[PDB]
Design an enzyme around this catalytic site. Structure first.
Site, PDB file in Angstrom:
ATOM      1  N   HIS A  77       0.827  -1.123  -0.116  1.00 50.73           N
ATOM      2  CA  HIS A  77       0.081  -0.124  -0.039  1.00 50.73           C
ATOM      3  C   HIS A  77       0.880   1.345  -0.121  1.00 50.73           C
ATOM      4  O   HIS A  77       1.066   2.068   1.105  1.00 50.73           O
ATOM      5  CB  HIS A  77      -0.900   0.022   1.111  1.00 50.73           C
ATOM      6  CG  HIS A  77      -2.047  -0.871   0.947  1.00 50.73           C
ATOM      7  ND1 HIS A  77      -2.148  -2.120   1.890  1.00 50.73           N
ATOM      8  CD2 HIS A  77      -3.153  -1.059   0.254  1.00 50.73           C
ATOM      9  CE1 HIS A  77      -3.102  -3.007   1.236  1.00 50.73           C
ATOM     10  NE2 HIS A  77      -3.781  -2.235   0.550  1.00 50.73           N
ATOM     11  N   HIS A  81       0.876   1.120  -5.769  1.00 45.07           N
ATOM     12  CA  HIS A  81      -0.487   0.667  -5.603  1.00 45.07           C
ATOM     13  C   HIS A  81      -1.559   1.659  -6.008  1.00 45.07           C
ATOM     14  O   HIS A  81      -2.439   1.373  -6.999  1.00 45.07           O
ATOM     15  CB  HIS A  81      -0.845  -0.276  -4.377  1.00 45.07           C
ATOM     16  CG  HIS A  81      -2.350  -0.368  -4.201  1.00 45.07           C
ATOM     17  ND1 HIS A  81      -2.984  -1.253  -4.997  1.00 45.07           N
ATOM     18  CD2 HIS A  81      -3.059   0.197  -3.301  1.00 45.07           C
ATOM     19  CE1 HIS A  81      -4.101  -1.215  -4.577  1.00 45.07           C
ATOM     20  NE2 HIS A  81      -4.200  -0.269  -3.514  1.00 45.07           N
ATOM     21  N   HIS A 117      -6.812   6.809  -2.610  1.00 43.93           N
ATOM     22  CA  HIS A 117      -7.761   5.814  -1.744  1.00 43.93           C
ATOM     23  C   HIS A 117      -6.909   5.181  -0.770  1.00 43.93           C
ATOM     24  O   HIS A 117      -7.736   4.621   0.326  1.00 43.93           O
ATOM     25  CB  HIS A 117      -8.363   4.897  -2.823  1.00 43.93           C
ATOM     26  CG  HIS A 117      -7.851   3.825  -3.058  1.00 43.93           C
ATOM     27  ND1 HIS A 117      -6.750   3.692  -4.170  1.00 43.93           N
ATOM     28  CD2 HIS A 117      -7.563   2.369  -2.557  1.00 43.93           C
ATOM     29  CE1 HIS A 117      -6.263   2.724  -4.274  1.00 43.93           C
ATOM     30  NE2 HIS A 117      -6.838   1.696  -3.327  1.00 43.93           N
ATOM     31  N   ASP A 118      -5.832   5.259  -0.748  1.00 42.07           N
ATOM     32  CA  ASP A 118      -4.825   4.449   0.352  1.00 42.07           C
ATOM     33  C   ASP A 118      -3.985   5.416   1.048  1.00 42.07           C
ATOM     34  O   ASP A 118      -2.774   5.004   1.417  1.00 42.07           O
ATOM     35  CB  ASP A 118      -4.328   3.302  -0.032  1.00 42.07           C
ATOM     36  CG  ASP A 118      -5.002   2.068  -0.182  1.00 42.07           C
ATOM     37  OD1 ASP A 118      -5.893   1.913   0.699  1.00 42.07           O
ATOM     38  OD2 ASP A 118      -4.877   1.360  -1.067  1.00 42.07           O
ATOM     39  N   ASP A 229      -8.929  -1.459  -7.742  1.00 37.99           N
ATOM     40  CA  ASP A 229      -8.223  -1.537  -6.270  1.00 37.99           C
ATOM     41  C   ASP A 229      -7.709  -3.153  -6.284  1.00 37.99           C
ATOM     42  O   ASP A 229      -6.364  -3.431  -5.974  1.00 37.99           O
ATOM     43  CB  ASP A 229      -9.212  -1.533  -5.015  1.00 37.99           C
ATOM     44  CG  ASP A 229      -8.487  -1.285  -3.869  1.00 37.99           C
ATOM     45  OD1 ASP A 229      -8.928  -1.628  -2.828  1.00 37.99           O
ATOM     46  OD2 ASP A 229      -7.175  -0.985  -3.699  1.00 37.99           O
ATOM     47  N   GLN A 282      -4.815 -17.802  -2.520  1.00 38.17           N
ATOM     48  CA  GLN A 282      -4.993 -16.990  -3.600  1.00 38.17           C
ATOM     49  C   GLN A 282      -6.006 -17.436  -4.504  1.00 38.17           C
ATOM     50  O   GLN A 282      -7.012 -16.671  -4.980  1.00 38.17           O
ATOM     51  CB  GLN A 282      -3.653 -17.138  -4.481  1.00 38.17           C
ATOM     52  CG  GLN A 282      -2.429 -16.081  -4.032  1.00 38.17           C
ATOM     53  CD  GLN A 282      -3.049 -14.536  -4.116  1.00 38.17           C
ATOM     54  OE1 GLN A 282      -3.744 -13.946  -3.141  1.00 38.17           O
ATOM     55  NE2 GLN A 282      -2.379 -13.788  -5.059  1.00 38.17           N
TER      56      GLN A 282
HETATM   57  C1  LIG Z   1      -1.648 -10.147  -6.467  1.00 37.28           C
HETATM   58  O1  LIG Z   1      -2.929  -9.487  -6.272  1.00 37.28           O
HETATM   59  C2  LIG Z   1      -3.345  -9.630  -5.188  1.00 37.28           C
HETATM   60  N1  LIG Z   1      -3.169 -10.624  -4.389  1.00 37.28           N
HETATM   61  C3  LIG Z   1      -3.647 -10.799  -3.119  1.00 37.28           C
HETATM   62  C4  LIG Z   1      -4.747 -10.161  -2.920  1.00 37.28           C
HETATM   63  N2  LIG Z   1      -5.336 -10.132  -1.384  1.00 37.28           N
HETATM   64  N3  LIG Z   1      -6.065  -9.033  -0.865  1.00 37.28           N
HETATM   65  C5  LIG Z   1      -6.599  -9.223   0.504  1.00 37.28           C
HETATM   66  C6  LIG Z   1      -7.101  -8.525   1.380  1.00 37.28           C
HETATM   67  C7  LIG Z   1      -6.390 -11.051   0.345  1.00 37.28           C
HETATM   68  C8  LIG Z   1      -7.051 -12.063   1.252  1.00 37.28           C
HETATM   69  C9  LIG Z   1      -6.753 -13.062   0.964  1.00 37.28           C
HETATM   70  C10 LIG Z   1      -7.276 -14.367   1.733  1.00 37.28           C
HETATM   71  O2  LIG Z   1      -7.158 -15.611   1.588  1.00 37.28           O
HETATM   72  N4  LIG Z   1      -8.172 -14.109   2.883  1.00 37.28           N
HETATM   73  S1  LIG Z   1      -8.444 -15.136   3.785  1.00 37.28           S
HETATM   74  C11 LIG Z   1      -9.663 -16.106   2.865  1.00 37.28           C
HETATM   75  O3  LIG Z   1      -9.243 -14.516   4.830  1.00 37.28           O
HETATM   76  O4  LIG Z   1      -7.686 -15.870   3.961  1.00 37.28           O
HETATM   77  C12 LIG Z   1      -6.200 -13.591  -0.349  1.00 37.28           C
HETATM   78  C13 LIG Z   1      -5.497 -12.799  -1.068  1.00 37.28           C
HETATM   79  C14 LIG Z   1      -5.830 -11.182  -0.928  1.00 37.28           C
HETATM   80  C15 LIG Z   1      -5.128  -9.000  -3.688  1.00 37.28           C
HETATM   81  C16 LIG Z   1      -4.573  -8.630  -4.576  1.00 37.28           C
HETATM   82 CL1  LIG Z   1      -4.887  -7.557  -5.762  1.00 37.28          CL
HETATM   83 ZN   LIG Z   2      -5.981  -0.132  -2.488  1.00 37.33          ZN
HETATM   84 ZN   LIG Z   3      -7.193   0.401   0.944  1.00 30.05          ZN
END
Ligand SMILES: COc1ncc(-n2nc(C)c3cc(C(=O)NS(C)(=O)=O)ccc32)cc1Cl
Ligand SMILES: [Zn+2]
Ligand SMILES: [Zn+2]
Length: 323
Positions: A77, A81, A117-118, A229, A282
């Site tokens: 962040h 980003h 936004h962040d 986002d 993921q």
């Molecule tokens: C490469 O891009 C990205 N990679 C990962 C995330 N991201 N953001 C969050 C919040 C998040 C939570 C989980 C999770 O597994 N949450 S859990 C079920 O509560 O364990 C997994 C990936 C996440 C977002 C982006 Cl844009």
């Molecule tokens: Zn953001």
């Molecule tokens: Zn945010």
């Protein structure tokens, strides 16, 4: 100073040259100055600069102030980003054909919100702020704590002498724009996305979705903010993988803080000792959070398909690692 003189004196390259209309855009090879030039180009090609009488030097100063007010050593962040979020917004408006569905003030607010936004993100989540007795959490009643803070910061920069890119708006346009900005920034709280998306998906499913309805337009803008986002998840695999590493670094750093400050074992997401869970998490995140959103956006505009396509491709790659 110095940075402003360099930025303000530069000839801004074309959107074509800067590749900013591409959903598959990468910022990694760009200098800070180049990202600022891309940002000026976004304002220019969305017809915001002349439309709203933005002075060049003021726009340049505002961009640099926004950039400065990200915390450079927060892993994910940070300015890159925010810049990527704004670039996805630009691509969605242009290549994704969302621009003609929106008002000039909506476009103005979305771009500002995307960039802002962040702001001043501390690299820890809302729940962490709540659990460590943050004054911000107390101020904001534990609701979208970070996002209220980002909005406060956004306001502060917009009002800072020499940075007032909205100073040329009429009273009514200014009122309208600030309201959209607030809702757009708050929408980036993933908790609010989860709360409101059901309504959006249902309207689409039941053939009731109508952008001419002001409430549904607001709902759509919120969803569009989330889509931008989250857009790293849609990028070509090597870009997405590099950004996923940053996300993990930030989450694991929070887990370290939780062990020390809260005396708790972090959840898997935030536990570096269980980094083996990343591929499965993921996939879970893509399924639970991302796919439905990019599907809905593609329903609204078919030209947004590449976001969905990229998300699906990354799901395949993560699943191959997980299994
Ligand atoms: C490469 O891009 C990205 N990679 C990962 C995330 N991201 N953001 C969050 C919040 C998040 C939570 C989980 C999770 O597994 N949450 S859990 C079920 O509560 O364990 C997994 C990936 C996440 C977002 C982006 Cl844009
Ligand atoms: Zn953001
Ligand atoms: Zn945010």
């Amino acid at each position: 100073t110095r940075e402003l003189q360099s930025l303000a004196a530069a000839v801004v390259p074309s959107a074509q040259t800067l590749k900013i209309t591409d959903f598959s855009f990468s910022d990694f090879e760009l200098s800070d100055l180049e990202t600022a030039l891309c940002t000026i180009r976004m304002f220019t090609d969305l017809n915001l600069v002349q439309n709203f009488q933005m002075k060049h030097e003021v726009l340049c100063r505002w961009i640099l102030s926004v950039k400065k007010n990200y915390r450079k050593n927060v892993a994910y962040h940070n300015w890159r980003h925010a810049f990527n979020t704004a670039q996805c917004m630009f691509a969605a408006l242009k290549a994704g054909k969302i621009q003609n569905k929106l008002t000039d003030l909506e476009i103005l607010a979305l771009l500002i919100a995307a960039l802002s936004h962040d702001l001043d993100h501390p690299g820890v989540s809302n729940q962490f702020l709540i659990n460590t007795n943050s004054e911000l959490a107390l101020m904001y009643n534990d609701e979208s704590v970070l996002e209220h803070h980002h909005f406060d910061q956004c306001l502060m920069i917009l009002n800072s002498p020499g940075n007032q890119i909205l100073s040329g708006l009429s009273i009514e346009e200014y009122k309208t724009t600030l309201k959209i900005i607030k809702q757009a920034i708050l929408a980036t709280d993933l908790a609010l996305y989860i709360k409101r998306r059901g309504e959006f998906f249902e309207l689409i499913r039941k053939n009731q979705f109508n952008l001419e309805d002001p409430h549904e337009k607001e709902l759509f803008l919120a969803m569009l903010m989330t889509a931008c986002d989250l857009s790293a998840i849609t990028k070509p695999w090597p870009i997405q993988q590099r950004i996923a590493e940053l996300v993990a670094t930030e989450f694991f750093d929070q887990g370290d803080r939780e062990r020390k400050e809260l005396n708790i074992e972090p959840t898997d997401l935030m536990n570096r000792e269980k980094k083996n869970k990343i591929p499965s998490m993921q996939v879970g995140f893509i399924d639970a959070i991302c796919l439905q959103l990019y599907e809905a956006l593609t329903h609204v505009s078919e030209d947004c398909f590449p976001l969905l396509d990229g998300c699906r491709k990354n799901r395949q790659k993560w699943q191959a690692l997980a299994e």
